[PDB]
């Protein structure tokens, strides 16, 4: 599996993030995170580097060349959907970075290193960066970097943007049904219904149903739906999920005629990941006194201040009679579930979330 490190990191990040946010909606792009963090890693040395490789799961299994090939595959023109991943480096115009770093970051990440005036015009630089990300995401991520995230001491901002727009292989019918948020709350949601031949299974270890909903082309959504807590009902699934347990099923399913009910939903979440990444073991990178980014600058005068991630998803019915029985499988997502969008060719997780609260 040529995207195993990324998936391992994704799951460990999700678990750590769930400590901070145990029940509310949660949405992120592990691919985007991993790409930016690999560019940061390329600059690290010493204990900073060793910790980053551990956290990003590079030691659990040519790193930069693997990112280059995976990105190429993710960016391949298809006709079936829109999918773009783009990296970018913004650097203080008066700073002198290591020539090998700028070269190799361009070579492996295609980051088109650009000078900006953080030293004197930080707020204009913030706006310029935000605007670039807005453009790459077709307006969907308009203000990645919040107020105060950049200042006169900022020297480099490393950025990834991802955008995906797909249509279901089979459209849904737009059908309100009660959604069970927790043992004390139900909220009405607009449901979408499909009856179709689909891959469906059950992961005993996680006590959850798994469904694959294909888009046109080689991208799918997988949904994981518990069938033991008075909260979201996800505690078991979230605590016990692992790469081995998930990958067996995404990459064991048999096709059947399934009646599917899922909510129409839209999420938009913003994270600041320093605390999470420190918790996962990436400590020295964020330590002003200890950080070693000599790969970026031989002066060894840099540290990682913060990591900002913003992700959104909008799920609806859009796709490219007489049946009356109900003997067979149902997948009725009227209570919280996990979901992920998988690039089937690379086996990379592009997006991963928890839908718990309409």
């Amino acid at each position: 599996d040529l995207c195993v490190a990324n998936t391992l990191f994704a799951l460990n990040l999700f678990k750590h993030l769930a400590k901070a946010s145990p029940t509310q909606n949660l949405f992120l792009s592990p691919w985007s995170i991993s790409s930016t963090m690999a560019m940061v890693y390329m600059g690290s040395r010493g204990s900073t580097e060793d910790q980053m490789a551990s956290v990003l799961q590079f030691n659990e299994v040519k790193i930069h060349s693997s990112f280059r090939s995976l990105s190429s595959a993710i960016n391949a023109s298809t006709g079936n959907y829109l999918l773009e991943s783009v990296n970018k480096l913004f650097g203080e115009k008066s700073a002198s970075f290591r020539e090998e770093y700028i070269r190799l970051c361009q070579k492996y990440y295609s980051s088109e290193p650009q000078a900006v005036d953080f030293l004197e015009c930080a707020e204009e630089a913030r706006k310029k960066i935000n605007s670039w990300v807005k453009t790459q995401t077709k307006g969907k991520i308009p203000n990645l970097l919040p107020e105060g995230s950049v200042d006169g001491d900022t020297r480099m901002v490393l950025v990834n943007a991802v955008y995906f727009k797909g249509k279901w292989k089979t459209p849904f019918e737009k059908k309100l049904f009660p959604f069970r948020v927790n043992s004390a709350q139900r909220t009405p949601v607009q449901m979408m219904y499909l009856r179709e031949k689909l891959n469906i299974g059950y992961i005993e270890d996680l006590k959850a149903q798994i469904l694959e909903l294909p888009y046109a082309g080689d991208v799918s959504m997988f949904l994981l739906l518990p069938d033991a807590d008075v909260s979201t009902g996800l505690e078991l699934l979230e605590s016990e999920i692992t790469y081995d347990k998930l990958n067996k099923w995404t990459s064991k399913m048999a096709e059947d005629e399934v009646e599917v009910y899922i909510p129409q939903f839209k999420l938009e979440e913003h994270y600041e990941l320093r605390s999470i990444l420190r918790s996962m073991g990436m400590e020295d990178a964020f330590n002003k006194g200890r950080a070693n980014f000599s790969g970026m600058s031989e002066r060894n005068d840099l540290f990682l201040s913060e990591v900002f991630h913003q992700a959104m998803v909008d799920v609806n019915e859009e796709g490219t009679t007489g049946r009356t029985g109900h003997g067979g499988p149902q997948f009725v997502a009227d209570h919280p579930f996990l979901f992920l969008i998988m690039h089937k060719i690379t086996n990379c997780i592009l997006f991963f979330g928890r839908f718990s609260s309409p």
Binding site: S29, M39, I141, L304, A311, I341
Partner: peptide, 14 residues
Amino acid sequence: TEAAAGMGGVMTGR
């Protein structure tokens, strides 16, 4: 499905 994301790491001088 429409989905998107951004990621920004900020390097700061010391």
